[PDB]
Ligand binder design. Sequence first.
Ligand SMILES: Cc1ccc(C(=O)O)c(C(=O)O)c1
Length: 437
Amino acid sequence: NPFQFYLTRVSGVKPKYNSGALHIKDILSPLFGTLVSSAQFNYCFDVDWLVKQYPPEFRKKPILLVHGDKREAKAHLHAQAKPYENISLCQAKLDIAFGTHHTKMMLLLYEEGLRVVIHTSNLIHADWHQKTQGIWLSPLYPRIADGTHKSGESPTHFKADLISYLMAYNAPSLKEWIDVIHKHDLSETNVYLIGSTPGRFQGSQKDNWGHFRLKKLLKDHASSMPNAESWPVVGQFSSVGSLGADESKWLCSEFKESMLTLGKESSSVPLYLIYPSVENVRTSLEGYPAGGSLPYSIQTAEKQNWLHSYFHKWSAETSGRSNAMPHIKTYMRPSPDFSKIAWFLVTSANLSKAAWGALEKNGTQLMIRSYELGVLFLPSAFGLDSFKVKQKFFAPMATFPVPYDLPPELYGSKDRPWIWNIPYVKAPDTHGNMWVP
Ligand SMILES: Cc1ccc(C(=O)O)c(C(=O)O)c1
């Protein structure tokens, strides 16, 4: 395949559904490279568990943990890392309130080159056990020979864009990784980087991040087709923020507007949002505890009941993962019959203004609260006009492996979105348990 898009291994499904899936131990294996140093960007870490995922021969190499924790939470992370003298920490600044360091990325420096992994999983056992998660693996990037002056840049601008993303941290430990990236040849990269970083961006800087970055890439590197108004937008996520009193406040006015962009010329487009129902969670491999990783609060949900008419069940027969609750986040643009897609994005970004950005000051300023990162697959970057949808995820390689079922199925009249902080006590889950948060 050209795409290098993988799901994580799921315990408790038949082995055919893990054929070609990746566990964290596979990513860190000596088969992927002879590790010299690594950086782990994430939200949540179990350091004892993380260190055991590295092969023993690599377990003492330097590891940088890039996190967003403050106050008592920051102290706990430092206490976790203290027994491991090779572990350094970088606290990403979060100077806008209610922001999160949500980016999930590995930088892996080898004797043979450099690899970048952009994925969706926290660095805890539960996130790699029975969930649907997504991974993009970069090629092995060779070092540019000293004395040679080359850009090492790809047609998607990935090298400069990744450096720009890291520069926004203003962190000395990350300037070291910027210098590593500068020394490597990333020209084989066929995906576009879509990041979010905290700030208030005006003028052209608006196009650097969040949903305006997606809009700019779709304008410059995708083309509109006849009947484009008939091509739906699909968003699929594990958390929902406060979107406003109706769809015109943000969802259908600016978020959907960016996602429906195609080409440079200047809405009826259907919007499908995929988010687990209570029933999906109750009968999952984990049962109700899967809902601990599906944060949608009752306080937020009750403000926006209009939103739930957009909601569609989680179903993933194609990858054997209907019962592996999603922590992956994906966005894509299928054709009216769902047989082709105009693009596909895997990202950390949930359905949230904090992640994607919200316009302020009469539309002159894009405000983002959080760090997010994803990769965008555009047909043009592969010499194609569209991607065919892979019929069965694990069975021409111009076919993109969409990990869940199409078309998405609307919630039934008695279905409700999973809301994590209310009790579910009238029907036991897979393990015979009730949920009382
Ligand atoms: C509210 C929140 C906080 C952290 C995460 C995460 O990094 O897992 C999530 C998620 O992605 O569901 C959601």
